[PDB]
Structure formats: C-alpha cells, structure tokens
C-alpha cells in the first residue's frame, strides 16, 4: 500500500525480468540482475541503506555465489575497524567536550568582529569535521552559529545570516574530504583499493585546502553584507579540566602515528593493517586512561554505516566472482577507447557531483566504487584514481537538502529558501567538477 | 591512581613476569602469558569486557600469532550475525509492544487471584526471556511486578513480596537457557562447537522445563505467605493493532524455520549456516513488512556483546595456534585420567556455578569455553558436552547481585536484603549442580 513497498515490488519484478530475459552466460545474468536490484535499492532508499547492505550477502549466498561465512567475512574488513576507532576517538572528545573548547578558544580570538567571526566559524567547522563526522559536526555547529547571528538579528537582513548557515553546511562536507576518518565514502575507497591513512590525506587534504576558500568565495560573491556587525560572547567560558589535555594527548599521539605510519611500521617489522591497529590502540588508550566509557562509544558509533561498508565489499566481490566486472569492461571497451582520459574523468566527476544531490553520500559511493574499481581492474588500470575521485565527488553535495544531512540541518532553520541553496550549489558543483578534473589530471605523473 | 588502573598495571606486570620467567617453548609461554592476562581482565573487569575483547586481536597480531585481517575475521563469525538477527527480532516486538500484550493476555487469564498471578508472572518472564534477553526482560518485568505487589502492600509483610521479585529475576535467567538466542553464553558455545538453533534447544529447553519448577519450589519452601491476596488490574487494556499479528506472524515463521531447519535446509540444497540466513531473513522480513525501523535495531542491538563474541573466538584460535591447548591437555593428562567423567563434570559444574556469582555470565563463558573446548579437543573428545555445560552453568547466577543484571535490577528495589538472596542462591546453586551433572550424565549415550 505504501510508496516504497511498491518500489521494492517493482524491483523484485525488474530483477525477475532481467533474470529470465537477459541473453548471456548465466553468471553474468545473475551479476547484472543483482547489480541493478541493489543499485535501485540504494538510490531510491526504499529499504534502509543498511538493510540493503545486509540483503547483499543473503542474496550472494542463496544464489550460490559465496558460502554463508565467506560472504559475512566481508563485514570484518580491517578498514571497518579503523572507522570504529574513529567513532571512539570522536565519542571521547565530544563527551569530554574538547570540541567545545576548540570552538571557543578560536572564536574568542576574534575580539568582537563579525568579519573575523564567520571566517573563523568555517575554519573550525572544517577542522573539527576532519575527525568527527559531517552530520555530527553540523548538528554541533548549529547552536554556535545561531548564537553569533543574533546581533545582526534582522532577518529582513537575510543574506548576512544565510551566508553563514550555508557556509558551515558546506564546510562540514569539505572538511570530510580531508582524512580517511571523516566521512564514509573515503573509507569505502580505501577499503576497495587498499589505501593507508597517510595515503588518503595526500589526496584529500590538498583538495580541502583548495576547496574551502573556493567555496566561501562563491558564497561571498553572491549576496554578502557582513563587513558590518558586532559580537555577543554570551555563555560560560571554557577551560582545560581533567585530561582534556589527555584526550588531546591521545588524539595527538594517534594522529602522529597515523601520519608517520609508513616509517614507524616499516621500522617496526611491517605489521599488516598498521592504521587499523593504531585506530584500535586508540580505543584501548582512551579506556585505560579512563577518559571515555564504552556506552558512549556504542551510542556514537554508527553501526549502520559499519555494516554498510561490508555490504558494498560483498557487492564488489559479487561483481568479480560472477565476471560481471569483466563483461562490463568488454561492453564499455569501444566507448572508453573512443574517449580521452580527460573525457572519462570529466564524465565521471560530473556524474557523481550531480548524482550525490539526489541520494546519500555513502549510498552512492557504496554503489559506485565497486562498479568502477572492478571495471577499472578488468581494463588493467590502477582502480585508485577513479575510486578516490568518486569518494571525493560524492562528498560534493551542495544543491538541495536531502543530499546530505548537513544540508537538511541548516535548512530546518526555517529560514533558507529552496531556490537560494539550489543555485549556489549549481555554481559550486560546476566549480568543483573543474577543480577535481584539474587535480585528478595533475595527480597522474 | 584508580583501583582498576592498578589491576591493569599489576596485570601488565604479571604478563611480563610470566613472559620472561616461564620455562617452556616460546609459543606456549606467549599463549600462557596471554591466557592469564586476558583471564584477569575479564574476571576483574578492570577494562570493559568489550575493550578487553578488542585487546585480544591487537595482541595476537602484535605478537605475530595471526595477521591483522585473519584475526579480525573472527568478529564476522556466522553466529554473531544470528545473534544480531535475535536483537532485531526483539527490537521489533518491543517497539511494536507485542511483549506487553503477551503479559496482559496471560495475566488477565487470572481473574483476580494472587495465587495464580505470580505463578503466571514467572511463566511469562521465562517465555518472554527465551527470545529477548535477560537484562531486558528483567527491566521490562519490574514495573509489571510492582504493580501486582501493591494490593498486599504491607512491606512488614515482606516475604509475600520478595518471593515474587527474586522469582522473576531467576525466571529471566532460566528462560535464557532455553534457546540459542536468549543469552550470550549459549551463542558462545554454539560458535565454538558449531551448534544449530534446533541443537541447542534439544539441550536447553528440557533443562529450562526442569529448572523453573525446581527454582520456584525452593523459593516457595522458604518463606511464602502468598495463598492470600487480591488483584488490582489497573491500567489501559491491550489489543492487537496494525500487524502485531504481523510481528507474531514473522516471529512465528522465523521460529518455525529455526526448529524445522534440518529438513528444510536439507531439502533445499544444504546451505551453510542456514540458521544465520534465517536470522538475517528475519531482519529483512521485518523491514519489508515495515514493522520496525533500523534506528530501533541499532539501539536494541548490544554491539558490545557482538564484539565480545569474536574476542573470545580470537582467543580460542590463539590457544590452538600457540599450542597452549595441547600443552594444558598434557599437563592435565594425569589428573583427568585419575578422575572419573562424573568427577570431572561435577568439578566443572561446581566451578562455573560459583564463579558466575563473582563475574558477568558472558565474561566467564567467553573465558572458559575456549580453554575447555580446545583442551577437550586435544584429548580427542567432542568439545560439545563440556561447552554446553559451561554455557548453561554460567547462566546459573542466583546468589549476590552484580552476578547478573537481573539480580541487580530486582535489588535496586531498595527492599531485598543482601543476606536473604545469598542463601536462596546457595541452595539453588547446589540444587542446579545436581540437576546439571544429572542431565549431563543422561545426555551421554
Ligand atoms: Na567530517
Ligand atoms: Na549525497
Ligand atoms: Na533471555
Ligand atoms: Na554471572
């Protein structure tokens, strides 16, 4: 009777149709029929993203592609645990309130000026986003933004107070493209192609450094009247208490090990997923040092996403095993040889940057990385380039809300118009397709 | 400076001491040193049970026993997912309120008598416990018990109103020993020895049927003045609404498949962990039928326990790989041949039943099943017997609180004395060591 129940039933119909009607070797038919079924479910979201992720192994198994245990093993991938270490690290500095003090210490550096208030609001949002999450950083920044935008209160003076709301909503998304922890898509890329923490930072951080100024400049050069205003530093000040220096101490130590993983691990005997161990070592240090309880981590951890990760890895392996990856490469062979590498990565970048407006970031990456990376491997090219690209471009959701929660968070502020965001995003989207295709070209040789 | 930080430091010392001072083949030294370290941490609970579980792979990897990924793979065991299916099934019928209606429909069968009120309170607690959890079933039953024990309100008339509080606190623990979902220890046994859902029910259910009357009879024959009293059916009645018949429908279908798994799977082509697939199929049916959202399951699911499971499976594999399992069998060889099989299982049963009073049920099972099962295998005997025994006896916590949350739940009722529970438990403990050793003997040939 419901909308989504029909989408699912239409999909069951579609699968059945593709299964009985495609003219190929049985394995490829099954692989294509599955890929379409799952592609629908993750884009429409008729079933919850994670329910769909669970549906993958259960299909793979029932259709004899993998044995039950083999399929489930996907969910214990070392990157998944790295990301859990991220959640525990976040959980710690949120319960401790080290995120609050980083906001105040930097916000009060601005004596009382609105010009150097919002420029220090975006800089903190993105810095805090590197380690925490996007949705979490947005929900945490909202009250701190509304607090500052109450002196220039006049909402007939909207464009002073919309530049700042839409500004952090993007700064949360751009801050994610910095490190391996931060947003889901990055983790999915790293798991697929086998990236280290320091590897994804070499790609991502420069792109964040490039993108944040570029994004503000676009918001600025639309309708900003913010060179005027005064401050209202209204609430109790902050101070380093029982081991906020300790949480920062562990955090610092962890990040130090993550960056210097290459020489530290090499000169340690070369353990396998060193970054994952570090991330679990973090969970251990935070508990021995007593700085955060487990119940806290169990609330903060998004087990839904953790499961989603493995759901996509299962899919990736479904594509290989059925030979669907190689069949698609064969079908695209003529098209891709006719296309220049510039043309390809421009088409890819454009495809995601706009697709990501309709569906969740992860939901699109969890679908697209498997397809592209495995097809890239059939072409015998390094699946890294396309993957990192997709992972970054997925986090470029700037147009409507429902694209990312950070967009819907600053939108529920019952103030910003649908039309307004839709056109700043349409500019920033094109701006990014440029920047990415540019940087993706530069990172070739 | 804290108590537990010293326990941990004392343990780090102990490990270091055992590591540098034991006179054996390096692998066995490492295996022994690890086993002692982890044993301490799970019994003292200096670190949280789950933090300790994570510590296992991280040690195994750093001490070259397993490669990072191989060790983590333990956490994706098919039983863990079976148990997650249990959590989702519970989450459904709690959010739907199918547990409430099962309480009222059976409680109102008793017209208005206290004699047939509490006897129908224990019967519901245990039946509801089979599928839900122990801690969850206790916290859910508490208000429903205090509601009935307000007509015979006189708390100078204590023993009418302590027989019922301590009655359900046990009925929750005995109800767990019924099926594979229900309590952690059962799942740990099944994962270690490879049991089906219908397999553990053949052991457990008869034991629950035997134990519940035996437990009441002991509480009854101490200080019961409950053949007197009247009812107060005070609150809004219940009625089957939008698919509480559907949740029961799915639940019923799931349990039907679980019981009849053997012939259904056999006549289906023999899929690998059929019970796990059923449990995931449950998660899928519950979502397509829209009866429960995912956020609900993410709250209900105890991801801490889910992780604990794999922590112990990692340990089990640590014992084998280092050859510590075989070394212990050699050391115990003389002792066990001098002991009769009756003697052994009486010693084992007594050991756990009393050990489980000091530490969490899972925490003790997660420690003991690996040691015993793997040693049993070195002796070339089926590790099932000892394991199922340990798993059942672990759920026999009847003395103090802090033994199980269901004990601490009915204790926070600021009414029941420490001394009171301690001696009913001491009787029921001995009563059980009997029943188990009896049934364990009968289930031989
Ligand atoms: Na982020
Ligand atoms: Na998106
Ligand atoms: Na239970
Ligand atoms: Na216990």
Residue numbers in the entry:
A (entry chain A), B (entry chain B): 18 to 462
Q: Which sentences from the paper describe this structure?
A:
Membrane transporters belonging to the ubiquitous divalent anion/Na+ symporter (DASS) family move Krebs cycle intermediates or sulphate across the cell membrane typically by utilizing the preexisting Na+ gradient. However, like other well-characterized bacterial DASS proteins, VcINDY is known to transport succinate and other C4-dicarboxylates, rather than citrate (C6-tricarboxylate)1319. Our structure reveals a homodimeric arrangement, with each VcINDY protomer comprising eleven membrane-spanning helices (TM1–TM11), two re-entrant helix-turn-helix hairpins (HPin and HPout) and two interfacial helices (H4c and H9c). Viewed in parallel to the membrane, the VcINDY dimer is shaped like an inverted bowl with its concave mouth facing the cytoplasm, allowing the aqueous solution to reach the midpoint of the membrane.
To validate this idea as well as to gain new insights into the mechanism of human DASS, we replaced eight amino acids surrounding the citrate-binding cleft by their counterparts in NaCT, which primarily transports citrate6. We also determined the succinate-bound MT5 structure, which revealed that MT5 binds succinate in the same way as VcINDY except that T379V in MT5 makes no contact with the bound substrate. Our transport assay further showed that MT5 retained the succinate-transporting activity, with the KM and Vmax values both similar to those of VcINDY. These data implied that T379 is not essential for the succinate transport and NaCT may also interact with a trans-dicarboxylate. Although VcINDY and MT5 interacted with succinate similarly, pronounced differences between them were found in the extent to which citrate inhibited the transporter-meditated uptake of succinate.
